[PDB]
Amino acid sequence: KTPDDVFKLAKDEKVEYVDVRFCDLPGIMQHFTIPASAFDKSVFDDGLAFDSDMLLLPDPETARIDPFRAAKTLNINFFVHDPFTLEPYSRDPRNIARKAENYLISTGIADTAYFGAEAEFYIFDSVSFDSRANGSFYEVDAISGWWNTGAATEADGSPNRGYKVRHKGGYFPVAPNDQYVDLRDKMLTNLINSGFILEKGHHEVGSGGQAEINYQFNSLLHAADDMQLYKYIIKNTAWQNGKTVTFMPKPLFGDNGSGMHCHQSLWKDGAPLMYDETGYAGLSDTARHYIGGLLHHAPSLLAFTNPTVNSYKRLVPGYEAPINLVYSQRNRSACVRIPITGSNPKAKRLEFRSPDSSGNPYLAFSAMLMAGLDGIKNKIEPQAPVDKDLYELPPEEAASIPQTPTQLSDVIDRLEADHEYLTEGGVFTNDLIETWISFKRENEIEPVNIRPHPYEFALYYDV
Amino acid sequence: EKTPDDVFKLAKDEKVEYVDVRFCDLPGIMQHFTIPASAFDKSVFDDGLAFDGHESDMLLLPDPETARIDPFRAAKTLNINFFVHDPFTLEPYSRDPRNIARKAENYLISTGIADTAYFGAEAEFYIFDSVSFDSRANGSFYEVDAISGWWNTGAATEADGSPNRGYKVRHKGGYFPVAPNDQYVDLRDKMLTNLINSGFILEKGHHEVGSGGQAEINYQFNSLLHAADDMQLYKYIIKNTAWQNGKTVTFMPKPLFGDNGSGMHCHQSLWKDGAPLMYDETGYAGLSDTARHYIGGLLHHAPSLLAFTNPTVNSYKRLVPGYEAPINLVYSQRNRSACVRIPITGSNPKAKRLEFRSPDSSGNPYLAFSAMLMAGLDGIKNKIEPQAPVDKDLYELPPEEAASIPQTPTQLSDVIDRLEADHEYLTEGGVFTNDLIETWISFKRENEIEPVNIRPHPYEFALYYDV
């Protein structure tokens, strides 16, 4: 969306520093700042050096004004390139994504992939945690937390006023029960100001400590950029107002997980490919195959989709979790749900409900698109839909319903075995997958695995 | 009433940035989500909004009447109450309290007895500074406190370190003393302002009254459904006025032991082709043939009716045999211990109504109001005659001459059984479904009656540890 446009923004707004941003492999953004003067034409054509060593080239589409910086700052995202060969670095997620958009163009099946994500998050007043030789602990807190019901007085001394208990009847009570109304307002304002579009099905929902704002869809790469931006604005708006946000799958035990339902659809020559009045749920064979690709590769898809150890405290056989490998229109417990849109072809999409916000959105959306394209290119048929509720059906008839693996170590094992569908088009390279597998095993899987669980003592000190 | 167009005017004049989509849960706690102002166009009134809570997905349709500017949100927010429909069939959801009241108001018309049922409810509440409580395996506790609480006469300093300045104790004489005994004057006025600015009408028999921690403000009547809408708004505004002044409110039936209960009195009337039915000098008190038959209906149905008018386990710490609590099934002109009570309307035709004295605010105003009107109508159908009025005292009149004055049931688990055993007048017209009531019977049993029943009371320790 034109270098010259970004230069207009720089002037109208009177920008004085530019925040160069880029994405580390496990998916936390990185930044440094240059003065506005040092940002010009030559930045877009040549790039910027930085440190091993990297050449950074900017994406004109991702330019945003920073609501939080005291100086007037414009943030832009960049693709990492190798300074010698000038060629897109292999393990830059923004590139893994860009190659995925381009692969989709070469197949000639469709030209654009539209992603839309619904990312939930927790708001807390404080968190502390710590692992030692002889002990370990964590504790999150918040004023409105139902476990603070018999509190003498609050954190800051002020009297305990009640209105905390997660009650019965609904999930989204009005104030004073809704104790973070004004915070979510600020967030939504900051999102609307930072150019997020909010139309029909888009809203701010708030269930006590947990909240969700959804915005309009976007093209795969830019959907992911939006997703990193959303997180950034949500986190910092809480930060700037004395709170602390976490997107982690399962911070509260015996309460709700924080999911990310991803809506995907394919378009070509300016028309939707997912609609067909005649087929089930109004789904065309292209869509049905795509779903079949997702359900076939789910076991290895979850490696990027739900890539933390914490992820599998949410995806656990119990809560009616999106772990059942079928598609549906009803079932919440099914992996792929289809949103009831109607006779409108433009809205017809499919919602993959397993993912969580803990992943790298660039690799996640890509991994999904790759799995779906595999479904299309191999005409895979998904096992028939399941519309009547799953909790009420014979134990044997419902034993034909396969499950997602329930551990990080497993999905990582599975990614290791079958990852062929990801190597297509030079998107995920066999190198990068080795790295993703090693990275998780060495830095997550096993360092968690060697540390005794607090609850283990409950069970076993007495033995 | 006001059309959709006025709502897009209000929003625009006020410079609303967000619109609050409110709908009611089954027990009667408002639910909401927020959408930007720009996303609130005319298609909202025609096509509706989607969201998801057997049911899964749901279509929500706005009520142009209930649009109000939130005084409390920092962002400029307009609130509108919605009806729940079937996304596919456009059919009202049989379990949506506002729908239920809608059905009630239509049914009334489908009988031709009248066209409009009016309600207006004086609802009482408590203001506290603090509340804490908690249930564990090896014990329980609760404690409300407030600065003006009489149990705090001996305090050395107040909570904020400030000296104790007296003027607390509940006295003998009257219930509504002036400052400084009335410590909650500025807060109550603030509440009043907020209700006035949020559009409530205060006129004749309408007042703000302050009895210690307990307080009450009564506002103008409204048609059954919109009366209940008003009822919600009223709680919201009190609650949130308190909250933003660092206090805490509660509408529960009995927060304090050995002290007053919080009670919601519902005045009913009926109207047709612009005129009131209830009036007629030639009969008792001013009551017409229909008015009396109505009253009969309330009285014959009370044991099941209470299941909606007096829902909570806490509802029956107010309604106790002794306190002169409205448990007696007769109508009256003088008795505060009587279920129905005809107010001194000074025989002008329009003001003739009847006040039900039993229900508390701890309910679902939609269902309550609806089920009340349902009882009153069945009473009109079978021309049901209510036992003779009682104008002489109940506290003092021969013990075996007034023995056959019947009593409402005094437990929750009791009244629910009456409901599970007789619910026809409610299902008449499909106003209440049988499916709805079955769940509300089950609610209630699982979620209220049973978990209370299985927890030891602290006082059981006073009684029994030593045994």
Added chain:
Amino acid sequence: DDMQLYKYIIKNTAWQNGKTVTFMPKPLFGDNGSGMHCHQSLWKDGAPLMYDETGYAGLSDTARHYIGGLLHHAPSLLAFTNPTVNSYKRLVPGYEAPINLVYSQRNRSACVRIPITGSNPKAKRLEFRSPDSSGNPYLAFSAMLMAGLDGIKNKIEPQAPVDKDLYELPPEEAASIPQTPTQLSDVIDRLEADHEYLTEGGVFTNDLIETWISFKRENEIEPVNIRPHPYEFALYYDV
């Protein structure tokens, strides 16, 4: 007398070693209750009256009728047996507590369970499992025996014994088993209704029983009822 003694000795041994004991039927929520399992037999001329091999579970025709008397008068018998408000926090439908008005040799869930004693005529007895130590052992034993006798005199035949599992037996097939009342106020109302098996022979007097009722109502039932439960705040402060 032994029972009062036991209690006293238990309480005081603890008290003397810096602790504190309680026989209240349910002191901990979501944990076990303290019950009193009562074994009964009748004897004549130094020889037991309860044994018979050709009858069910080794019972005599005396023993069976006796049982019928307990189960028919249980709704009233509990007013002495389980005479406190706190008793019904133990005898609530849920924990599968001994509430089902049937007799067994298997069930932990029935009021009367016959102790497996095999072929010894002396050792055959009946264990009435509902009572708690919160009552008066004098009045409680008394009323058990009194109800047991009205069963022999009138020859009450108790419905079929159930060895089969009370936790899993078809929802409408076992919907034909009477429960005890689940509230003190109930068993009191039901003692006021029928208490004839008690005043037979002038053992319990109509007066005594009338005091007991007024004692339980005005000193226990009513003062608990008018006092708000902490869990009510958990339920309703928000309304």
Added chain:
Amino acid sequence: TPDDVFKLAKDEKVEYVDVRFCDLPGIMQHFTIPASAFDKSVFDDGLAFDGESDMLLLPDPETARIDPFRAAKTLNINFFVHDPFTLEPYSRDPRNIARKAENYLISTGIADTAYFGAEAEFYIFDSVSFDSRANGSFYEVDAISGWWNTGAATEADGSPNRGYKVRHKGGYFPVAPNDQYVDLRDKMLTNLINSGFILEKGHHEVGSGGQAEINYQFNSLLHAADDMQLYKYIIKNTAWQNGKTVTFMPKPLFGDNGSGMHCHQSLWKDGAPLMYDETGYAGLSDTARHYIGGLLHHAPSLLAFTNPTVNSYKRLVPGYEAPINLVYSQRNRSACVRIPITGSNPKAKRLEFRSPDSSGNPYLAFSAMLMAGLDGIKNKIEPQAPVDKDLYELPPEEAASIPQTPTQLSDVIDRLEADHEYLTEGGVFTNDLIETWISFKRENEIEPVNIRPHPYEFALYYDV
């Protein structure tokens, strides 16, 4: 002999007798009866109780011990659970399972006695506290001697920090004052010798910082298991009585030693050892070889009984080289099975299974091991080549062919759920018992730990 015990009860002026018996996962249960009530009729008729409904309890005279901790003079005896009507050993009493194993061992004519000796490590702390709430979870153990306390200004009781704490380079078993628990361990050893444990040549009290171990003489399978139970009871209580608190949990300390139970085994017939053969390896007959063959073959499921806790697998990890390598050796501490150097003496010859931990039920652990051992003989299962070189330092493609034990309790439970015939042979283990054990572990241990966030997850992921 029954009569020994009555004279024991008499001589020691015993006033109470402790009726003991083993629950399913492995903690002993008890009720006390007066000494007056304990007579000839106990050993003949039995004793009645309930846990299913009513059960009969029959005493094992061998297990009779004076209780050194109870102030009232008390005698502890273990019992076997029987059905009151049929007089049938109960299908589920671990002590019966051990008994029944010992008999099946005779029924095959393979050997008549199965000898088990156990070296069970333990930890001594001054305090433990923990809990798991909705918004939080924690644990902490502490010991004044602990190397994390080097910088403490004062101790718990206020007296000054005197040093001599930190795990130091070169030595695992230092002398005092580094050995801060010398007088406690002594009391422990005294209490065992007093309680009828036998200590001889290879038997010794060792003490590694806060971890400690005391071996005692072998016994026949059932009694070995009884001893193990007893050994735990005395260790635990000896500390308890001295204001300390002990744990047999496999892995209480992150970044430190795990506690293991090494299980020495051998078989005998007609009073002749079956394990020796001067024709190698390590002087091992084919009986001994096939036994090992079975151990190593069934190890993937055997661990659901030898290492049956979620904690067990924080010790058994591909880390410090914990005994997870499916080979037998003479050198590697990282081998599952190892043969102790006995040299020429044919009676000392045995095989040491090194994976097990004391978080177990020894009756089941020991039975499961022997059952696996016999299937090894009956099927002449041949175990893969004995590794005598280093496991941590060898060509990666020649060490890739070395199989590993499963790394997680969830797995071994499943592996047990797949093949477990070798256990059900002769009716030692019933399919009924094994099933309960699976449901038990899955629903009570595997599933509850799983759904509870780990504190280090907040370290990794709060910032995601």
